[PDB]
Subunit: 662 residues, 2 copies
């Protein structure tokens, strides 16, 4: 009948408990369409409605703002708002568009005629924030089966008669008891967070084919060993993150087998997406990986009210890494965030999203962050494939301009699914020293694949193989200190101690000064210190610094006053500038009332806030923040669509952020 | 399993009988994909194949040209070529991509696992050409029920007791006998082509709900009256075009009723797209307009081997206007062109495509042209809604850069579906004089809605209504010479006699000199004459001509030597420049061999051709055409992917066209 298209286009994509949410819908129709409607919910119930009559939830109308006729087809634009909701509230809504004095309705995105087969949109109403510990976190991503074998008695599926090509895709015996033993070495490395490979009872050594969402495979140990590991890692002030697989199970899961035999008389038939011809929804056509239907009400309750608290509340994990966060819906992640952030708002929830950064942005407001694949892709091509250092800068610059400031991009060089950096760099550890150094001097949360610090690479070429190319990314950790690259280990320990002792290197603004191919200098702003980083992977060259200032090589406690500097060949260093920068003492507000309004500092947060100013609706305000009667923030703007007593907040780390928070 | 995407991306989109056709396929996959394949056909049979084994047709492989891994997903590019085919050949092909040493296959665009549910691509192998008479054609689009009532005895469904609001959407009595009577008036207007509204036996007076594809509704007359009309219009050297409805029937069609009752035991059950729950494919949700399934083999044979020859061969129509050409597939139109162009290659086949010009371009090679909706949209907003004359120039310029030179864009101001121009221009006939003049001085084939020349407009406002807003675009033709706008008629007759007596105004190059808002001057190049057109819909102004040359107002046989000219207010004129331009006498070819190769003229066509030069495959040639040892075509390029003895052709109307035709 037409083409209703909403596509999650709600105006405040990350809504506060104050602002209303404007829903804009584009419709391409032949016959008439006159008005639509929103049928949104506040509890966890599924929303439904039709032609202005809501079945479960409240109603809000869609009204034609713009319309015309282009190439004999009529193009109208419908708009409506969802009323503001309280903090920590999951809003699910469905959208339809019909014609007054007509027969029927048509829903959003799916163009369905009924609410049941329509797209279910959702967002989470909350002052969006990520755990502050996750911003400063340095993560040691370990593959449990390939780390250490602290107990050979748990190696039930290990066949020692296998060759390396045959054992690397099978079980090798790494267990959670080994992570307990080598916990001193992990702590000596300097990391403050441990990311554990999946430990589900599955038929494969990687654990991504769960046959029990709430059970540890005996090949890795027991829950008590896991509880002992997490508790011992907690007594060292380290955090533990679990690699969580919510999208799919294996065909061997008791739920899938019971549904595969009993059919519709099975309690788990609707827990998967079975089709009317025997086919079922799967993960990329893998018949052994049926997609777990998290959009089913009784299955979404099992994942959220049974499985997730088992790992976060019972086993006391500190966070979850979500395998294939694209699988489940946004309406599931909105429910997921309300569940995990009600247990503890300091529980790190970041996902593995195989998509561009313009689509990873849609996960903001639901997840605390994601894995920076753009970091991976634009670091191999630069440091391992000899690229331009601009693609490094062109990556950092576009992260600031696209991602929400609270979104945490976890950066990495290797994966259990991607080739090792050392092997892609020809085992030239000088390039890995540059990448690991540049990473720990760039914004984000660095992740260290378990073997990288000792030179663990690939014992074979992956291009020579098929299907199981990922054998050689999951080789066993080397502990023989003769076979280890102790120079690389002492390098990783030193680049960690620097980042862990300089807040500007973790949560500081980024600014590039000069950069050529195989040459880059940049700075890391803050409010307590500044730093200058210089990295070159080619010949020696000179790069032009903006200002002129004395420096201090943090490694070799020297100094250097100059306007330029000659970065060495295949060398790198980070310099700390020395500035008696007068800290913030007074912040005023110029542009709202007749005279400047002096703000008051909040020591709990790090912001300056106004007192309580009334504003008229849709009134285009225009103002700025002055600093100690000297410099001033460039002019801002804001429209208070609903209410009056709105408050002005000034975060000096994000000064241009128009955060007129009620 | 992946995302195979071909999207009709064959390199020669309009293939000659000489060039091979390169098929490029983009695949976004997780697991491996190593090779694909093309399964193309030459006859009318449906193509099918799997994993290199073709079921109906020949096989051509798809090989990975490029590949990488981006954001943990692998992106490969498959390529293969379809061998060159003879002239007048319909190539249908299907495309799949699989993994060697894998299990199964996956097909193009639909991502289906079988060939039956895959996208069926097609193109037509032919030296693409549109009927030369259709390029110069001036069309008089009449709505048969609203023209003249030459026989009141055929008004079976006319209810004289109805009001105008109720009769304008019902039957009024216009018949083909009236078109016979008023044929002198149509010929006096000057048009050389008549476009007839649909005459199918349907339940509505517009005829777009056919209940008999090969039957004339008695409310319009008989076949003999239609045969008499077409024959009488032929004896006056006029052409007749039929408005053809191939996409859908009405629910009252005997085929649909028999299938609606007998079900799968009906011979026409597969002739529509019935769904397994009682729903059926329809035209924009209209349950009374079920979509006729032209992709069914037995239905495509009924349309092409029974219905189309009934109108083009039996009733001896000169062409078909195709209602909603987007409905049927491209694989249907490839069959459709092979059928109508085998009856007579001088049969005009142009379609009604409700889409952007970048998508109307895909109909080139299958249809002779289309209706220029961009002309309509960007002429109401300019001449009836007071816009910029640049949007007129920005429309003509983008037609040259996007459309194939043989594609014929039929321009119009009104439709039976769009509001009248006079009513959108506030009955200000001075604006309609400007639009009708500017139209007949612009490239394309002008179409005249039946009432426009006598000031026929709308007796009511369409915004006041719903569903049947198109009553007021289909009002009855006025014949009382007092109620007619004879000034507008004498205007249309004069702007026709000019275009019909100046070949540069029909098939001549377009060049804009100066243009402001409500002001425009341009020229129309050719090889026998040049013209200058000046149009202003605002106040008087002066526009800067490029060169300086004397002119001649074709209306008032005056002259004017100057470098600029002052176009009047709400006035317009077309001037013919006077130039003793030495015609083409010698054309040589500089760049292929060591010395210039003199070309020979072909009087049958209008081109200069080479003699027969051998070329190596993929050899980047670079050459030009010199004219009478004076000016030269700017350097061209060409690669002969297959063969040797290729010939060079020079069309002086399209000189930059690299037509190295074998
Ligand atoms: Ca996975
Ligand atoms: Ca695998
Ligand atoms: Ca129609
Ligand atoms: Ca209608």
């Amino acid at each position: 009948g037409s083409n209703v298209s909403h596509n999650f286009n709600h105006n405040p994509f990350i809504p506060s408990p104050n602002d209303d949410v404007e829903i804009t819908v584009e419709v391409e129709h032949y016959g008439p369409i006159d008005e639509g409607g929103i049928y949104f919910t506040t509890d966890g119930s599924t929303p439904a409605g039709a032609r202005g009559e809501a079945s479960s939830g409240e109603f809000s109308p869609l009204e034609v703002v713009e319309t015309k006729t282009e190439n004999n087809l009529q193009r109208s634009t419908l708009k409506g708002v969802i009323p503001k909701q309280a903090d920590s509230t999951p809003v699910k809504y469905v959208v339809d568009v019909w014609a007054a004095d007509g027969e029927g309705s048509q829903y959003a995105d799916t163009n369905s005629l009924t609410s049941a087969e329509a797209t279910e949109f959702a967002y989470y109403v909350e002052n969006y924030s990520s755990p502050d510990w996750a911003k400063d976190a340095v993560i040691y991503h370990i593959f449990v089966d390939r780390f250490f074998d602290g107990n050979p008695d748990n190696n039930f599926a290990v066949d020692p008669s296998l060759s390396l090509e045959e054992a690397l895709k099978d079980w090798m015996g790494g267990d959670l008891e080994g992570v307990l033993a080598k916990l001193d070495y992990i702590e000596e490395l300097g990391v403050d967070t441990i990311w554990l490979s999946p430990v589900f009872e599955g038929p494969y050594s990687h654990g991504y084919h769960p046959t029990d969402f709430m059970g540890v495979d005996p090949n890795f140990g027991t829950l008590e060993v896991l509880k002992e590991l997490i508790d011992e890692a907690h007594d060292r002030d380290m955090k533990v993150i679990y690699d969580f697989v919510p999208n799919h199970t294996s065909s061997e899961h008791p739920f899938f087998q019971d549904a595969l035999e009993n059919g519709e008389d099975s309690p788990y038939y609707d827990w998967y997406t079975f089709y009317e011809d025997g086919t079922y929804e799967t993960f990329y056509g893998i018949e052994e990986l049926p997609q777990f239907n998290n959009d089913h009400p009784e299955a979404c309750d099992y994942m959220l009210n049974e499985v997730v608290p088992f790992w976060l509340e019972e086993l006391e994990f500190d966070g979850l890494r979500l395998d294939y966060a694209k699988g489940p819906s946004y309406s599931f992640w909105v429910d997921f965030r309300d569940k995990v952030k009600s247990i503890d708002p300091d529980m790190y929830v970041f996902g593995e999203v195989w998509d561009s950064r313009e689509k990873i942005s849609s996960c903001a407001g639901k997840l605390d962050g994601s894995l920076d694949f753009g970091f991976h892709d634009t670091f191999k091509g630069t440091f391992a494939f000899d690229g331009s250092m601009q693609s490094v800068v062109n990556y950092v610059e576009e992260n600031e301009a696209e991602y929400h400031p609270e979104y945490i991009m976890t950066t990495f060089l290797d994966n259990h699914d991607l080739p090792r950096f050392l092997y892609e760099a020809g085992n030239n550890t000088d390039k890995l020293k540059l990448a690991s150094f540049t990473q720990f001097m760039l914004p984000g949360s660095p992740v260290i694949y378990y073997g990288t610090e000792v030179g663990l690479s690939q014992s074979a070429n992956h291009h020579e193989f098929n299907d199981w190319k990922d054998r050689w990314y999951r080789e066993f950790m080397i502990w023989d200190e003769e076979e280890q690259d102790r120079e690389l280990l002492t390098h990783y320990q030193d680049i960690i101690e620097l980042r862990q002792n300089h807040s500007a290197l973790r949560t500081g603004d980024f600014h590039a000064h000069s950069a050529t191919r195989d040459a880059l200098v940049f700075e890391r702003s803050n409010e307590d210190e500044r730093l200058i980083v210089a990295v070159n992977k080619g010949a020696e060259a000179v790069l032009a610094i903006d200002e002129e200032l004395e420096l201090e090589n943090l490694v070799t406690g020297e100094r250097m006053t100059g306007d330029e500097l000659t970065v060495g060949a295949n060398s790198f260093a980070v310099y700390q500038v020395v500035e008696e920068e007068k800290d913030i003492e007074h912040v005023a507000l110029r542009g709202v009332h007749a005279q400047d309004i002096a703000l008051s500092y909040d020591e709990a947060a790090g912001v300056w806030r106004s007192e309580g100013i009334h504003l008229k609706n849709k009134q285009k305000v225009t103002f700025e923040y002055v600093i100690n009667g000297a410099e001033s923030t460039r002019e801002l703007t804001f429209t208070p669509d609903r209410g009056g007593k709105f408050e002005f907040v000034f975060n000096p780390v994000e000064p241009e952020q128009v955060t007129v928070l009620h």
